[PDB]
Every structure is written in C-alpha cells, then in structure tokens.
Amino acid sequence: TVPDRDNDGIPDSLEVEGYTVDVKNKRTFLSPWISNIHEKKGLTKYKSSPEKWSTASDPYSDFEKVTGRIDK
C-alpha cells in the first residue's frame, strides 16, 4: 500500500514531485504529472506538503481543495 503520512488521501511522492486532477469520462482521476499529456490539456500542476493535511493550515484538505469536495 502506498505511503501517505498526513492522511489527506494523496500519496507523498505525488505531493513532492507534482500531481493533477482530471475528469475523464464522468469520474475524477487524481494522477501524477506527465509533461507530454497534461500540459496541452490546460491542466494545472500542483505541489504541496506530504506531512501537512492542509498545506496552508486552513481547515480544508489538499485533496478537497484540488478536487472540489469543498464548501462551494
């Protein structure tokens, strides 16, 4: 099982190196950054801290912020 220290639902390697969020058919996929694919699709590249549940110390996760599972 993949390591995830802060328990924010996103692994530590992706937080240190870079990730993005991408709906594909009607389902949301969280995926590592690939320069050949996600650049031309207009996708933003996120980095965050693998040991903080909320990198800005506000009460919303990194996962909820990048995904949309947040107070609208």
Partner 1 sequence: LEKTKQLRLDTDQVYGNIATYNFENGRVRVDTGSNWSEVLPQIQETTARIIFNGKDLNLVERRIAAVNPSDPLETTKPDMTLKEALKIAFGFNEPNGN
Partner 2 sequence: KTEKEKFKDSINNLVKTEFTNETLDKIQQTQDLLKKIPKDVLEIYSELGGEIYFTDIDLVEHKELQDLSEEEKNSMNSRGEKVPFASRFVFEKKRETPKLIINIKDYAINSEQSKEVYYEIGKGISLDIISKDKSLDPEFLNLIKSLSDDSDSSDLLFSQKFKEKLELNNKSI
Q: Which does 37 bind (CB under 5 to 8 A by kind): a second copy, partner 1, Ca ion, none?
A: none
25 binding a second copy? (CB under 8 A)? yes
Q: What is the token pair recorded at 5?
A: 């220290």
Q: How far is CA 72 from CA 5, 52, 64, 65, in A?
A: 27, 23, 11, 10
Whether residue 4 is annotated as binding a ligand: the answer is: yes
56 binding partner 1? (CB under 8 A)? yes
Q: How many CB atoms lie within 10 A of CB 27?
A: 6
Which residues are near a second copy by CB under 8 A? 5, 12, 15-16, 25-28, 49-51, 57, 72
